[PDB]
Amino acid sequence: SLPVIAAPSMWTRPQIKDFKEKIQQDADSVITVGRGEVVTVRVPTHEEGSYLFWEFATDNYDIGFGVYFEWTKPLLDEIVPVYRRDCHEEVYAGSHQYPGRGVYLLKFDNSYSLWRSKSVYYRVYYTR
């Protein structure tokens, strides 16, 4: 049988001020998504890893968020369908079990925004 892909988990947590303060302590964890832009963040599966955990937030506006899995032309699986989230109001978080070796694509989608740039604070971990 082809690999069964686990459903992702998603949740929020309220402390967005503290989250962004923590993340701001490193420049590279802060992304500017221009008007009409889509920023993709590639997160490879670690050789000792089992799960991917993500957190993200924005400053003044919502943004589209999706997760895809790239198998190592290459096959792409939809893990979290892209949808607008109010990650300016709360920290958005989620996880997914490794379906196999490959690369996760975190997509921060600002396609729909004509006039607004978004600042994206994000963080990712993995488990053994």
Binding site: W11, R13, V38, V39, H46, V124, Y125
Partner: protein, 43 residues
């Protein structure tokens, strides 16, 4: 060491910076250095 799905259930239910830091100390979760992540922009 607990199972990954147990970690998952914990973080989902009582998520906080404190719980993250604790899981990190125990080496249950390991942070991906953001500077090692490939970031792509597309219009």
């Amino acid at each position: 060491t607990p199972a990954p799905d147990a970690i998952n259930d914990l973080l989902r239910s009582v998520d906080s910076q404190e719980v993250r830091d604790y899981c990190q100390k125990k080496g249950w979760i390991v942070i991906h250095p953001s500077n090692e992540l490939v970031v792509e922009k597309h219009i």
